[PDB]
Amino acid sequence: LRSIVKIGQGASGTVYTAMDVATGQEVAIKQPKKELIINEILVMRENKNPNIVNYLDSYLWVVMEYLAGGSLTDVVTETCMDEGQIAAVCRECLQALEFLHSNQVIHRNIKSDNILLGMDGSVKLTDFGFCAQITPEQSKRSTMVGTPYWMAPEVVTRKAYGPKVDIWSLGIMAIEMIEGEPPYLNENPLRALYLIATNGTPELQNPEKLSAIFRDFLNRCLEMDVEKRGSAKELLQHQFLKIAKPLSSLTPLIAAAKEATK
Numbered sequence: 376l377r378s379i380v381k382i383g384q385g386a387s388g389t390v391y392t393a394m395d396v397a398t399g400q401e402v403a404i405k406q407p408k409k410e411l412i413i414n415e416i417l418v419m420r421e422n423k424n425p426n427i428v429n430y431l432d433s434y435l436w437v438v439m440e441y442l443a444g445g446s447l448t449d450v451v452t453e454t455c456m457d458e459g460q461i462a463a464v465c466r467e468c469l470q471a472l473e474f475l476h477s478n479q480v481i482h483r484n485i486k487s488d489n490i491l492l493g494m495d496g497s498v499k500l501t502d503f504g505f506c507a508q509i510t511p512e513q514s515k516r517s518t519m520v521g522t523p524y525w526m527a528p529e530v531v532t533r534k535a536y537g538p539k540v541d542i543w544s545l546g547i548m549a550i551e552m553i554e555g556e557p558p559y560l561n562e563n564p565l566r567a568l569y570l571i572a573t574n575g576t577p578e579l580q581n582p583e584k585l586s587a588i589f590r591d592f593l594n595r596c597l598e599m600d601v602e603k604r605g606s607a608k609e610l611l612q613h614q615f616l617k618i619a620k621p622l623s624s625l626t627p628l629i630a631a632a633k634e635a636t637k
């Protein structure tokens with residue numbers, strides 16, 4: 376409990392900004408279910424990585440690092456991304472996922488909403504409120520947690536699921552970067568859950584627009600066979616990531632996004 380211790384929209388609490396007095400760093404400060412809070416700070420403090428929004432301190436308040444580029448959601452809903460930019464974002468997210476999975480942590484809520492962007496093009500992950508710390512003795516989980524449209528079918532059907540569900544969600548995020556929305560978004564969340572259960576691997580509106588390499592990456596991200604689905608370390612070696620652009624190539628997207636949402 377106590378043991379470990381304005382850009383605000385209502386959200387699930389509010390957000391503000393500030394500056395470091397001594398070093399000058401700019402920081403962002405977040406201001407129902409406290410047990411999840413305990414899990415969240417514990418997981419955040421011991422899992423620092425360049426591709427994760429780093430947790431600074433706590434006081435309920437939470438101080439974490441500053442990224443002024445916004446979230447990937449504004450980019451995917453207001454801009455058109457090309458395969459190079461998508462590959463760069465996917466590589467950053469896969470690096471974060473490899474780091475977490477090597478530490479036996481499953482995010483379970485990967486989506487464009489939980490990706491933050493720096494003005495330099497930095498791609499980072501956040502929102503650990505839905506973590507799953509697994510172990511050799513208990514390495515699977517059946518709780519139906521996450522956001523419906525991004526949830527893997529094995530999670531939806533409450534089967535035994537592992538870290539690769541994150542991979543599935545990453546694939547859904549890739550569809551976001553292609554079409555602007557995850558599959559079934561016009562449907563309500565419950566019908567969306569049923570459609571994920573009954574259809575399986577989602578179909579793209581216009582797959583013809585994609586290179587065979589990108590289709591291959593998606594097919595290895597959205598494979599129903601968990602053994603056949605790729606791990607983060609396996610996917611980091613995919614040829615798709617070879618056509619990745621420099622992160623500095625996301626700065627225009629960010630610039631476009633802020634123009635669109637103003």
Ligand SMILES: O=C1N=c2ccc3ncsc3c2=C1CNc1ccc(S(=O)(=O)Nc2ccccn2)cc1
Pocket residue numbers: 381382383390403428439440441442443444445446491501633
């Ligand atoms: O840098 C950040 N680290 C964060 C960690 C968690 C978190 N949770 C919600 S936001 C956030 C974090 C940020 C930055 N968040 C952010 C929010 C809005 C914008 S913005 O493009 O919309 N600019 C602004 C600025 C003031 C008021 C409203 N919007 C930019 C970054």
